[PDB]
């Protein structure tokens, strides 16, 4: 399939303090590779994957400037929005930006992205076309037409289809070993009797990459979206992920429930039964 690059920017205005805390994180697919923290003593774009510091100092130097500058703006923007919403300075407000690009299996350009959100709520975002903006509320409209004035539509597209994609390509080849891996989930099933008539069949899947995974319980071959419980995928801390799906079972019917596992790495889907 495809590949993806995403940067996540969050700025939270600290009341009484002039500069807010800024956190920028860079991922490829599901592997983080750069981090920048305002409260970090580095004040420099740090590497966080093994394959990124083969890029020379000219890269780290410009990459730091790039999001020192992105941080500067959020500082200025946090104040601009404080005015758009009639909000006092003693509050704490968050600006969250995420932009990135998607390449296909042949390095092709597929999709661009840029979304902005103020206090966990949608603010402004770039449509699929990359030519249109859509403003969530009133305030975002006074920003929307401001960006439409400067052709922000175009110039986002020239980052997304230019250096963004050329970066994602160069990363997928420099860290060709790490990034093109796939790791089939290491599976196992669990039996916890709860009552004298029911138990719980839990369906585990440890150690897999990428994080895309599909767990589904089935009674007699019929989909079971009812007594099913599914925790969101957890990171194991070593670049691999885990996810388990449990179901409540009437005693003596475990041989009727079937757990089915779908992953990108696996050639064919798994099935687990007691």
């Amino acid at each position, epitope marked *: 399939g495809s590949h993806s690059m995403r940067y996540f920017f969050t700025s939270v205005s600290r009341p009484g303090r002039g500069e807010p805390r800024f956190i920028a994180v860079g991922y490829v697919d599901d592997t983080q590779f750069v981090r920048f923290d305002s409260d970090a003593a580095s004040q420099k774009m740090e590497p966080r994957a093994p394959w990124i510091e083969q890029e*020379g100092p000219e890269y780290w130097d410009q990459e730091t400037r790039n999001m020192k500058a992105h941080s500067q703006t959020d500082r200025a923007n946090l104040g601009t929005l404080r005015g758009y919403y009639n909000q006092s300075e003693d509050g704490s407000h968050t600006i969250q930006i995420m932009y990135g690009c998607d390449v296909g299996p042949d390095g*092709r*350009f597929l999709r661009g992205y840029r979304q902005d959100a103020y206090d966990g709520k949608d603010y402004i975002a770039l449509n699929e076309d990359l030519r249109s903006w859509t403003a969530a509320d009133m305030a975002a409209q006074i920003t929307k037409r401001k960006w439409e004035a400067v052709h922000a539509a175009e110039q986002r597209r*020239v980052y997304l289809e*230019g*250096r963004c994609v050329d970066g994602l*390509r160069r990363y997928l080849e420099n860290g060709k070993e790490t990034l093109q891996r796939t790791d089939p989930p290491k599976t196992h099933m669990t039996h916890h009797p709860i009552s004298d008539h029911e138990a719980t069949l839990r369906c585990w899947a440890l150690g897999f990459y990428p994080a895309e995974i599909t767990l589904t319980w089935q009674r007699d071959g019929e989909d079971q979206t009812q007594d099913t419980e599914l925790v969101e995928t957890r990171p194991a801390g070593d670049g691999t992920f885990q996810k388990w799906a449990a179901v409540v079972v009437p005693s003596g019917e475990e041989q009727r429930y079937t757990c089915h596992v779908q992953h990108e790495g696996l050639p064919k889907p798994l099935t687990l039964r007691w």
Partner: antibody
Amino acid sequence: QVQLQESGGGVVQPGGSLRLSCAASGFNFSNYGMHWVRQTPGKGLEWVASIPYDGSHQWHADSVKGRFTISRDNSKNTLYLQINSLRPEDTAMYYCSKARISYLSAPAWWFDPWGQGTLVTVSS
Amino acid sequence: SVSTQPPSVSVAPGQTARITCGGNNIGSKSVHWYRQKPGQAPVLVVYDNNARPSGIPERISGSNFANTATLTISRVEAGDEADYYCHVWDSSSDHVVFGGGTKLTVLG
């Protein structure tokens, strides 16, 4: 994987008309601008004409304005260059290239990738 | 619409080559660079002043400031022998403007 294939060139005679075509593969051709850039053998590159994603307008260099007309067929993924009243000056190789950025209303950003091109040579 | 390149640049193998693309306020235009080896098509090696495409090695770097864009090739290999053209877009001309081209020779 993006591929451009020029054709239709060859040896022509002055005054005549000639039609170049560029067959495209490896991208939603309906979304990008396309360009023609020619090169007289032993000389530099020269921009000819270019056309936006839909064919709305038609950008012309002045040295070939009025005589050339560039078009595209999005249903065929093909870029065309029509040459009318061929002259000895049009003797050159004609490259076809795809504007990198999408939905550009005018041919302002860099052209990548370039096809191997076709050769147009006119003489008596 | 006037952008001028030197006609040829000769450099010793392993040295650092430097090709200029001068123009009136060319620093305020977006300059690109294409490398064309004999008989083949031009290849984008530097776009928007300094960006390198995926396949281009880091030896090749771009630059553009004031009135002169500059293509720099560090640690010249023999395979760097080709013609090099810069690319701008003249807003006030409706013309994409190529440079004259520079024939880089790495002498043996």
